[PDB]
Amino acid sequence: MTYKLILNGKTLKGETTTEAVDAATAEKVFKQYANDNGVDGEWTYDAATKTFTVTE
């Protein structure tokens, strides 16, 4: 399933797209890379736009 997350860290700003079976896996995959990249804090996501959102 096509999935995109906006990595809006405090200073680390970056947009990213990816794939995954469901949204839970995408969020996990995004969370990992986001965490791996040192990005996390706020975690928002919508099903209408089908896009993920994060911010520190």
Side-chain angles (χ1 to χ4, degrees):
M1 279 283 188
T2 310
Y3 272 117
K4 187 194 75 72
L5 191 150
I6 332 199
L7 263 90
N8 168 46
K10 221 56 118 275
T11 56
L12 200 159
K13 259 66 146 138
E15 254 268 47
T16 45
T17 77
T18 193
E19 242 285 344
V21 287
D22 55 55
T25 303
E27 181 254 301
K28 249 100 270 127
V29 177
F30 263 128
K31 193 161 262 72
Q32 193 62 67
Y33 171 71
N35 278 198
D36 296 359
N37 261 209
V39 184
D40 198 86
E42 225 295 86
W43 268 95
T44 139
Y45 156 80
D46 151 56
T49 58
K50 254 273 158 151
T51 280
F52 273 85
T53 47
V54 152
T55 294
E56 297 156 18

